[PDB]
Amino acid sequence: FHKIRNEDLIFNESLGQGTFTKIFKGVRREVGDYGQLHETEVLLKVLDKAHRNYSESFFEAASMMSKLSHKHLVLNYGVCVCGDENILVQEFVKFGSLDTYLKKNKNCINILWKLEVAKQLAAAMHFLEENTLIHGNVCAKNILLIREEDRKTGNPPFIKLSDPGISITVLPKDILQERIPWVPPECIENPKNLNLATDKWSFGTTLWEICSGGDKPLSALDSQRKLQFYEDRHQLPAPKAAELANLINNCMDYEPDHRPSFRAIIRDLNSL
Ligand SMILES: Nc1nc(Nc2ccc(S(N)(=O)=O)cc2)nn1C(=O)Nc1ccc(-c2ccnc(C(=O)O)c2)cc1
């Protein structure tokens, strides 16, 4: 990663927190193309100082994905590791995370919008699959909305997939249990079962979110009941708008080897 000086970063409003991270809107002063000076809006992801031992994991996966440029993968500008901070400096996406957007626009998002966002997410995951790169945390909060749909000019929405964050292969077991049903059953049994197949399961969970107006699946279940949900081999309920329900269940297959490739997933989406 390119190293950015703390002096060139200005922290502004908080935009929430993640797993052992805090999120801020920021500005980066930089020299851009042709030597022009810019003050660029950025998203700053700050690793909690108390959790400095997770720094390697947060940055590694972000790094490996940033070695692969793709239109549906978020741009990272660099890192700031001056002083006692570990900061990821990322492109600022105008409309933020998709989960909050789905809730705030539920009475405006139709099946064609969902199918377009689903196709774009599958395209990003196919790219990752072909590069044998595991994401490990596909969820609606990690889908960033670059552009809204514009029925006036026929423009579809446009999304990017955000960075993975700290790997589930190093997180505490109680955090992994809280992330059921995004974390697949095999990874609850053994976090070292993290595999390409993991992302197919979480992709299914993410489609469920996209179809459910921002609801979080199994949110009414505490961690103990989420564990028993997997032990009893339950599936998620079909969303009210159930057009993607079969694909969701096909992806959320308790047998990891049976989950369809993203090429097949894309073919399925294109048939709807
Ligand atoms: N690049 C980028 N630009 C923006 N712009 C923006 C944000 C908000 C609003 S707003 N307030 O007006 O709605 C408007 C514009 N957000 N953003 C970004 O990456 N956000 C982000 C934060 C946290 C996770 C996350 C997901 C799952 N797990 C974790 C974990 O660490 O556990 C973390 C993912 C993404």
Side-chain angles (χ1 to χ4, degrees), residues 157-172 174-177 179-188:
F158 195 96
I159 60 95
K160 290 185 174 200
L161 179 60
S162 191
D163 62 289
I166 299 164
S167 179
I168 61 181
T169 69
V170 315
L171 288 166
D174 70 310
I175 291 175
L176 255 58
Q177 290 183 189
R179 298 190 175 183
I180 294 175
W182 293 268
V183 171
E186 68 269 20
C187 287
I188 296 301

mmCIF file of all heavy atoms in Angstrom, residues 157-189, unseen atoms left out:
data_model
loop_
_atom_site.group_PDB
_atom_site.id
_atom_site.type_symbol
_atom_site.label_atom_id
_atom_site.label_comp_id
_atom_site.label_asym_id
_atom_site.label_seq_id
_atom_site.Cartn_x
_atom_site.Cartn_y
_atom_site.Cartn_z
ATOM 1 N N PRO A 157 -28.454 1.400 -11.165
ATOM 2 C CA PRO A 157 -27.562 1.684 -10.036
ATOM 3 C C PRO A 157 -26.208 1.041 -10.297
ATOM 4 O O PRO A 157 -26.072 0.157 -11.146
ATOM 5 C CB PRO A 157 -28.286 1.042 -8.843
ATOM 6 C CG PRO A 157 -29.009 -0.111 -9.447
ATOM 7 C CD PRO A 157 -29.482 0.408 -10.802
ATOM 8 N N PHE A 158 -25.187 1.508 -9.580
ATOM 9 C CA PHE A 158 -23.849 0.942 -9.719
ATOM 10 C C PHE A 158 -23.258 0.741 -8.334
ATOM 11 O O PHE A 158 -23.280 1.662 -7.512
ATOM 12 C CB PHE A 158 -22.924 1.842 -10.565
ATOM 13 C CG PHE A 158 -21.665 1.156 -11.026
ATOM 14 C CD1 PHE A 158 -21.592 0.576 -12.292
ATOM 15 C CD2 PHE A 158 -20.556 1.075 -10.195
ATOM 16 C CE1 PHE A 158 -20.444 -0.076 -12.716
ATOM 17 C CE2 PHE A 158 -19.398 0.421 -10.617
ATOM 18 C CZ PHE A 158 -19.339 -0.143 -11.885
ATOM 19 N N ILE A 159 -22.721 -0.456 -8.083
ATOM 20 C CA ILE A 159 -22.223 -0.804 -6.761
ATOM 21 C C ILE A 159 -20.767 -1.250 -6.858
ATOM 22 O O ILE A 159 -20.269 -1.647 -7.917
ATOM 23 C CB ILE A 159 -23.086 -1.897 -6.083
ATOM 24 C CG1 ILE A 159 -23.112 -3.176 -6.923
ATOM 25 C CG2 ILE A 159 -24.497 -1.410 -5.847
ATOM 26 C CD1 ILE A 159 -22.074 -4.186 -6.491
ATOM 27 N N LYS A 160 -20.086 -1.185 -5.717
ATOM 28 C CA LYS A 160 -18.768 -1.776 -5.555
ATOM 29 C C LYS A 160 -18.753 -2.584 -4.269
ATOM 30 O O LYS A 160 -19.495 -2.284 -3.330
ATOM 31 C CB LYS A 160 -17.670 -0.716 -5.488
ATOM 32 C CG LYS A 160 -17.389 0.011 -6.786
ATOM 33 C CD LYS A 160 -16.208 0.933 -6.577
ATOM 34 C CE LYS A 160 -15.734 1.602 -7.855
ATOM 35 N NZ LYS A 160 -14.324 2.085 -7.656
ATOM 36 N N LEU A 161 -17.887 -3.593 -4.224
ATOM 37 C CA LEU A 161 -17.711 -4.412 -3.031
ATOM 38 C C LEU A 161 -16.568 -3.850 -2.201
ATOM 39 O O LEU A 161 -15.485 -3.589 -2.729
ATOM 40 C CB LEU A 161 -17.430 -5.868 -3.406
ATOM 41 C CG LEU A 161 -17.184 -6.889 -2.295
ATOM 42 C CD1 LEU A 161 -18.381 -7.031 -1.311
ATOM 43 C CD2 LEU A 161 -16.905 -8.219 -2.978
ATOM 44 N N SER A 162 -16.818 -3.657 -0.909
ATOM 45 C CA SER A 162 -15.842 -3.043 -0.022
ATOM 46 C C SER A 162 -14.829 -4.081 0.457
ATOM 47 O O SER A 162 -14.913 -5.265 0.133
ATOM 48 C CB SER A 162 -16.547 -2.381 1.164
ATOM 49 O OG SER A 162 -15.641 -1.570 1.901
ATOM 50 N N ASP A 163 -13.849 -3.627 1.240
ATOM 51 C CA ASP A 163 -12.754 -4.490 1.660
ATOM 52 C C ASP A 163 -13.232 -5.486 2.708
ATOM 53 O O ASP A 163 -14.229 -5.251 3.388
ATOM 54 C CB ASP A 163 -11.605 -3.660 2.223
ATOM 55 C CG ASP A 163 -12.005 -2.888 3.449
ATOM 56 O OD1 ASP A 163 -12.783 -1.919 3.310
ATOM 57 O OD2 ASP A 163 -11.569 -3.274 4.554
ATOM 58 N N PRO A 164 -12.527 -6.614 2.853
ATOM 59 C CA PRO A 164 -13.053 -7.697 3.693
ATOM 60 C C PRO A 164 -13.063 -7.384 5.179
ATOM 61 O O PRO A 164 -13.917 -7.916 5.899
ATOM 62 C CB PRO A 164 -12.107 -8.866 3.377
ATOM 63 C CG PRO A 164 -11.444 -8.516 2.115
ATOM 64 C CD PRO A 164 -11.307 -7.029 2.143
ATOM 65 N N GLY A 165 -12.144 -6.545 5.668
ATOM 66 C CA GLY A 165 -11.965 -6.391 7.098
ATOM 67 C C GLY A 165 -11.175 -7.551 7.691
ATOM 68 O O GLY A 165 -10.633 -8.403 6.990
ATOM 69 N N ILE A 166 -11.102 -7.565 9.022
ATOM 70 C CA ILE A 166 -10.329 -8.599 9.702
ATOM 71 C C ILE A 166 -10.889 -9.975 9.355
ATOM 72 O O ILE A 166 -12.108 -10.175 9.310
ATOM 73 C CB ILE A 166 -10.346 -8.346 11.222
ATOM 74 C CG1 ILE A 166 -9.716 -6.994 11.562
ATOM 75 C CG2 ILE A 166 -9.619 -9.450 11.962
ATOM 76 C CD1 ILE A 166 -10.040 -6.523 12.958
ATOM 77 N N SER A 167 -9.998 -10.929 9.093
ATOM 78 C CA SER A 167 -10.418 -12.250 8.658
ATOM 79 C C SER A 167 -11.165 -12.985 9.767
ATOM 80 O O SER A 167 -10.810 -12.887 10.947
ATOM 81 C CB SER A 167 -9.205 -13.071 8.225
ATOM 82 O OG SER A 167 -9.603 -14.371 7.832
ATOM 83 N N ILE A 168 -12.197 -13.747 9.384
ATOM 84 C CA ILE A 168 -12.854 -14.613 10.358
ATOM 85 C C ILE A 168 -11.933 -15.719 10.850
ATOM 86 O O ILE A 168 -12.256 -16.392 11.839
ATOM 87 C CB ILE A 168 -14.158 -15.228 9.802
ATOM 88 C CG1 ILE A 168 -13.888 -16.093 8.573
ATOM 89 C CG2 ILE A 168 -15.184 -14.132 9.516
ATOM 90 C CD1 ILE A 168 -15.151 -16.709 7.962
ATOM 91 N N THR A 169 -10.782 -15.911 10.209
ATOM 92 C CA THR A 169 -9.815 -16.877 10.706
ATOM 93 C C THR A 169 -9.032 -16.374 11.914
ATOM 94 O O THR A 169 -8.266 -17.149 12.494
ATOM 95 C CB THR A 169 -8.832 -17.279 9.600
ATOM 96 O OG1 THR A 169 -7.988 -16.170 9.283
ATOM 97 C CG2 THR A 169 -9.579 -17.723 8.347
ATOM 98 N N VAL A 170 -9.187 -15.109 12.316
ATOM 99 C CA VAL A 170 -8.578 -14.622 13.549
ATOM 100 C C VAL A 170 -9.577 -13.962 14.487
ATOM 101 O O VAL A 170 -9.184 -13.487 15.552
ATOM 102 C CB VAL A 170 -7.398 -13.661 13.272
ATOM 103 C CG1 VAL A 170 -6.487 -14.205 12.168
ATOM 104 C CG2 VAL A 170 -7.890 -12.277 12.924
ATOM 105 N N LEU A 171 -10.851 -13.914 14.143
ATOM 106 C CA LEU A 171 -11.740 -13.202 15.050
ATOM 107 C C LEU A 171 -12.175 -14.099 16.205
ATOM 108 O O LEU A 171 -12.173 -15.326 16.078
ATOM 109 C CB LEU A 171 -12.969 -12.692 14.300
ATOM 110 C CG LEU A 171 -12.696 -11.510 13.362
ATOM 111 C CD1 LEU A 171 -13.858 -11.304 12.428
ATOM 112 C CD2 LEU A 171 -12.437 -10.251 14.171
ATOM 113 N N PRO A 172 -12.550 -13.502 17.339
ATOM 114 C CA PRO A 172 -13.107 -14.288 18.448
ATOM 115 C C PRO A 172 -14.331 -15.080 18.014
ATOM 116 O O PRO A 172 -15.112 -14.638 17.171
ATOM 117 C CB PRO A 172 -13.481 -13.223 19.486
ATOM 118 C CG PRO A 172 -12.611 -12.066 19.180
ATOM 119 C CD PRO A 172 -12.408 -12.079 17.688
ATOM 120 N N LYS A 173 -14.507 -16.255 18.626
ATOM 121 C CA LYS A 173 -15.613 -17.125 18.242
ATOM 122 C C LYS A 173 -16.969 -16.471 18.491
ATOM 123 O O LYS A 173 -17.921 -16.736 17.753
ATOM 124 C CB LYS A 173 -15.520 -18.461 18.982
ATOM 125 N N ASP A 174 -17.086 -15.605 19.502
ATOM 126 C CA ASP A 174 -18.392 -14.995 19.739
ATOM 127 C C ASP A 174 -18.743 -13.979 18.654
ATOM 128 O O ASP A 174 -19.925 -13.723 18.404
ATOM 129 C CB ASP A 174 -18.443 -14.337 21.120
ATOM 130 C CG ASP A 174 -17.579 -13.092 21.206
ATOM 131 O OD1 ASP A 174 -16.391 -13.171 20.820
ATOM 132 O OD2 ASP A 174 -18.087 -12.034 21.651
ATOM 133 N N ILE A 175 -17.743 -13.386 18.010
ATOM 134 C CA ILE A 175 -18.033 -12.487 16.902
ATOM 135 C C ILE A 175 -18.482 -13.284 15.687
ATOM 136 O O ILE A 175 -19.399 -12.874 14.961
ATOM 137 C CB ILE A 175 -16.807 -11.610 16.593
ATOM 138 C CG1 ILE A 175 -16.573 -10.624 17.737
ATOM 139 C CG2 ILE A 175 -16.975 -10.896 15.237
ATOM 140 C CD1 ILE A 175 -15.325 -9.803 17.582
ATOM 141 N N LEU A 176 -17.855 -14.441 15.456
ATOM 142 C CA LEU A 176 -18.259 -15.293 14.346
ATOM 143 C C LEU A 176 -19.675 -15.804 14.535
ATOM 144 O O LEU A 176 -20.445 -15.883 13.573
ATOM 145 C CB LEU A 176 -17.293 -16.465 14.195
ATOM 146 C CG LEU A 176 -16.316 -16.359 13.024
ATOM 147 C CD1 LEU A 176 -15.490 -15.108 13.152
ATOM 148 C CD2 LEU A 176 -15.437 -17.590 12.939
ATOM 149 N N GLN A 177 -20.038 -16.158 15.770
ATOM 150 C CA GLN A 177 -21.398 -16.608 16.022
ATOM 151 C C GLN A 177 -22.398 -15.491 15.777
ATOM 152 O O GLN A 177 -23.487 -15.736 15.241
ATOM 153 C CB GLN A 177 -21.516 -17.137 17.448
ATOM 154 C CG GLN A 177 -20.781 -18.426 17.648
ATOM 155 C CD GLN A 177 -20.965 -18.991 19.032
ATOM 156 O OE1 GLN A 177 -20.301 -19.957 19.405
ATOM 157 N NE2 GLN A 177 -21.873 -18.399 19.808
ATOM 158 N N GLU A 178 -22.038 -14.251 16.144
ATOM 159 C CA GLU A 178 -22.906 -13.110 15.858
ATOM 160 C C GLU A 178 -23.078 -12.887 14.359
ATOM 161 O O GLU A 178 -24.080 -12.304 13.930
ATOM 162 C CB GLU A 178 -22.358 -11.827 16.496
ATOM 163 C CG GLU A 178 -22.422 -11.791 18.016
ATOM 164 N N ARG A 179 -22.121 -13.325 13.553
ATOM 165 C CA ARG A 179 -22.194 -13.126 12.117
ATOM 166 C C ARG A 179 -22.868 -14.289 11.387
ATOM 167 O O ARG A 179 -22.841 -14.341 10.146
ATOM 168 C CB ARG A 179 -20.798 -12.896 11.554
ATOM 169 C CG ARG A 179 -20.093 -11.656 12.076
ATOM 170 C CD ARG A 179 -18.855 -11.471 11.239
ATOM 171 N NE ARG A 179 -18.120 -10.260 11.546
ATOM 172 C CZ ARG A 179 -17.042 -9.883 10.876
ATOM 173 N NH1 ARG A 179 -16.605 -10.627 9.863
ATOM 174 N NH2 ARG A 179 -16.405 -8.768 11.210
ATOM 175 N N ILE A 180 -23.437 -15.231 12.117
ATOM 176 C CA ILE A 180 -24.395 -16.153 11.492
ATOM 177 C C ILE A 180 -25.612 -15.345 11.061
ATOM 178 O O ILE A 180 -26.075 -14.488 11.839
ATOM 179 C CB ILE A 180 -24.784 -17.251 12.490
ATOM 180 C CG1 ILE A 180 -23.577 -18.146 12.807
ATOM 181 C CG2 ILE A 180 -25.952 -18.075 11.986
ATOM 182 C CD1 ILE A 180 -23.885 -19.174 13.886
ATOM 183 N N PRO A 181 -26.189 -15.567 9.863
ATOM 184 C CA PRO A 181 -25.901 -16.573 8.841
ATOM 185 C C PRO A 181 -25.041 -16.099 7.663
ATOM 186 O O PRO A 181 -25.151 -16.699 6.584
ATOM 187 C CB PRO A 181 -27.294 -16.932 8.350
ATOM 188 C CG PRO A 181 -27.990 -15.607 8.344
ATOM 189 C CD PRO A 181 -27.457 -14.875 9.572
ATOM 190 N N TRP A 182 -24.220 -15.058 7.847
ATOM 191 C CA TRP A 182 -23.263 -14.705 6.798
ATOM 192 C C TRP A 182 -22.058 -15.634 6.821
ATOM 193 O O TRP A 182 -21.580 -16.059 5.761
ATOM 194 C CB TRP A 182 -22.802 -13.255 6.949
ATOM 195 C CG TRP A 182 -23.874 -12.232 6.700
ATOM 196 C CD1 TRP A 182 -24.163 -11.610 5.512
ATOM 197 C CD2 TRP A 182 -24.784 -11.697 7.667
ATOM 198 N NE1 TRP A 182 -25.191 -10.717 5.685
ATOM 199 C CE2 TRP A 182 -25.604 -10.763 6.995
ATOM 200 C CE3 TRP A 182 -24.993 -11.925 9.037
ATOM 201 C CZ2 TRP A 182 -26.604 -10.043 7.649
ATOM 202 C CZ3 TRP A 182 -25.984 -11.219 9.685
ATOM 203 C CH2 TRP A 182 -26.783 -10.286 8.994
ATOM 204 N N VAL A 183 -21.577 -15.966 8.015
ATOM 205 C CA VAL A 183 -20.496 -16.939 8.176
ATOM 206 C C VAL A 183 -21.066 -18.338 7.962
ATOM 207 O O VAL A 183 -22.064 -18.692 8.612
ATOM 208 C CB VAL A 183 -19.861 -16.813 9.556
ATOM 209 C CG1 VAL A 183 -18.903 -17.962 9.804
ATOM 210 C CG2 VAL A 183 -19.148 -15.481 9.672
ATOM 211 N N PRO A 184 -20.488 -19.136 7.067
ATOM 212 C CA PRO A 184 -21.092 -20.416 6.716
ATOM 213 C C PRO A 184 -20.923 -21.448 7.818
ATOM 214 O O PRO A 184 -19.993 -21.356 8.638
ATOM 215 C CB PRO A 184 -20.331 -20.831 5.448
ATOM 216 C CG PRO A 184 -19.066 -20.140 5.516
ATOM 217 C CD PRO A 184 -19.324 -18.829 6.220
ATOM 218 N N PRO A 185 -21.785 -22.479 7.831
ATOM 219 C CA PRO A 185 -21.687 -23.531 8.859
ATOM 220 C C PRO A 185 -20.309 -24.144 8.999
ATOM 221 O O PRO A 185 -19.865 -24.403 10.125
ATOM 222 C CB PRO A 185 -22.696 -24.589 8.380
ATOM 223 C CG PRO A 185 -23.587 -23.889 7.423
ATOM 224 C CD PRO A 185 -22.828 -22.754 6.829
ATOM 225 N N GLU A 186 -19.621 -24.411 7.889
ATOM 226 C CA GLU A 186 -18.314 -25.052 7.998
ATOM 227 C C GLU A 186 -17.313 -24.148 8.699
ATOM 228 O O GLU A 186 -16.359 -24.641 9.314
ATOM 229 C CB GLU A 186 -17.800 -25.463 6.615
ATOM 230 C CG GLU A 186 -17.446 -24.306 5.671
ATOM 231 C CD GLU A 186 -18.609 -23.861 4.801
ATOM 232 O OE1 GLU A 186 -19.763 -24.160 5.158
ATOM 233 O OE2 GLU A 186 -18.370 -23.198 3.759
ATOM 234 N N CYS A 187 -17.512 -22.831 8.634
ATOM 235 C CA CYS A 187 -16.590 -21.914 9.292
ATOM 236 C C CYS A 187 -16.919 -21.732 10.763
ATOM 237 O O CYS A 187 -16.029 -21.393 11.551
ATOM 238 C CB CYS A 187 -16.584 -20.566 8.583
ATOM 239 S SG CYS A 187 -15.741 -20.669 7.003
ATOM 240 N N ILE A 188 -18.181 -21.934 11.145
ATOM 241 C CA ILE A 188 -18.521 -22.019 12.561
ATOM 242 C C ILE A 188 -17.894 -23.267 13.179
ATOM 243 O O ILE A 188 -17.354 -23.222 14.291
ATOM 244 C CB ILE A 188 -20.053 -22.000 12.742
ATOM 245 C CG1 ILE A 188 -20.656 -20.667 12.273
ATOM 246 C CG2 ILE A 188 -20.437 -22.283 14.188
ATOM 247 C CD1 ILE A 188 -20.106 -19.433 12.995
ATOM 248 N N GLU A 189 -17.947 -24.401 12.472
ATOM 249 C CA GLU A 189 -17.293 -25.603 12.978
ATOM 250 C C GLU A 189 -15.782 -25.415 13.045
ATOM 251 O O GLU A 189 -15.141 -25.812 14.025
ATOM 252 C CB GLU A 189 -17.661 -26.809 12.109
#
